[PDB]
Amino acid sequence: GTSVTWSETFDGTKTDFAVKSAPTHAVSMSQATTEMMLQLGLDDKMAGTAFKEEEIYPPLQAAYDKVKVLSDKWPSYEVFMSVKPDFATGWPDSFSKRAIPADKMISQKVNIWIPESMLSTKADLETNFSDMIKLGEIFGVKPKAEEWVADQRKTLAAIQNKLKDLPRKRVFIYDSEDGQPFTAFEGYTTNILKLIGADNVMSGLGVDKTWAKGSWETVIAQNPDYIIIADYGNSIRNDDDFQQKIEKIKANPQLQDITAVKEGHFIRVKLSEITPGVRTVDALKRLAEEIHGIKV
């Protein structure tokens, strides 16, 4: 009988939103929110998706195939409006002037919701769980979301039980480089890796950002045990991007005495696995096995 309510702020303008029934023409502007919605079984309520970045999480591919793709990137306002949307979600940039400004959508009575896990450097795995619950509440499927969170917690506990009394490891996340490495500092990626005893060496350095350029000097000083490398390839059956980045690191004389480099501790991830979405605990299972040598 009560409304599900929330607020968002765009360009200093705060808007209050409410729904009393599930949206029926929802548009997802980002792959991460697309996966969140598909995980909750919401394809029938979806009028469109946008900006696919990598292969859809395989359990969700068949549901993904049921939803109209509006654009390979972000759709124009006209294409967006053409599906009569009533709800939109995505990363914050989806609602900026680089895409479709939120105020234009709000003019047309579209409700906009953004996962809290995507809003600040405070975000952690619990924030992602809460976001899934909230998304569930908005769409009248709270029990489905609670069932998913419950399963994630059970699996996470199984991983952590295997890790009890194993030494923690220091890690460096290598997204890419352009002279300097681009890496993760604070927020979601750092916080979820801490759950499996993997401590981001770029965290705790006073840089309040999710991602930014770092200095190799800093990485060398921190001497990580493992280097986790984001693979930006098309197929999971192809780790060419991963291997090229390994070779780029190996070929850099400045990095040759870093522990991870000497020991060949290179670990492959997709960005979708270490940023908010539905893949986190599944990815943490694999990473825990690779970093700590356990089987869970």
| Binding region for Na ion (CB under 5 A) | 5, 7
CB of 33 to Na ion, least distance (A): 15
Q: Cβ closer to Na ion: 5 or 76?
A: 5
Q: Tell me the residue length of the chain.
A: 296
Q: Which residues, in sequence order, are bridge partners of residue 10? A: 13
Q: Cβ closer to Na ion: 113 or 139?
A: 113
CB of 265 to Na ion, least distance (A): 23
Q: Cβ closer to Na ion: 85 or 187?
A: 187
Q: Cβ closer to Na ion: 67 or 127?
A: 127
CB of 271 to Na ion, least distance (A): 6
CB of 232 to Na ion, least distance (A): 11
Q: How many CB atoms lie within 10 A of CB 162?
A: 16
**Angle at CA of residue 35, ends 145 and 53, nearest 5°:** 160
> What residue is closest to Na ion based on CB?
7
The C-alpha atoms of residue 65 and residue 266 are separated, in whole angstroms, by 34
Q: Cβ closer to Na ion: 7 or 107?
A: 7
Q: Cβ closer to Na ion: 5 or 120?
A: 5
Q: Which residue has the tokens 């098309």?
A: 234
CB of 228 to Na ion, least distance (A): 14
The C-alpha atoms of residue 39 and residue 60 are separated, in whole angstroms, by 7
Burial 113-122 (b: 16+ CB within 10 A, else e): bbbbbbbebe
CA distances from 93 to 59, 102, 287 (A): 27, 10, 29
- Phi (first) and psi of residue 65, to 5 degrees: -65, -10
CB of 280 to Na ion, least distance (A): 15
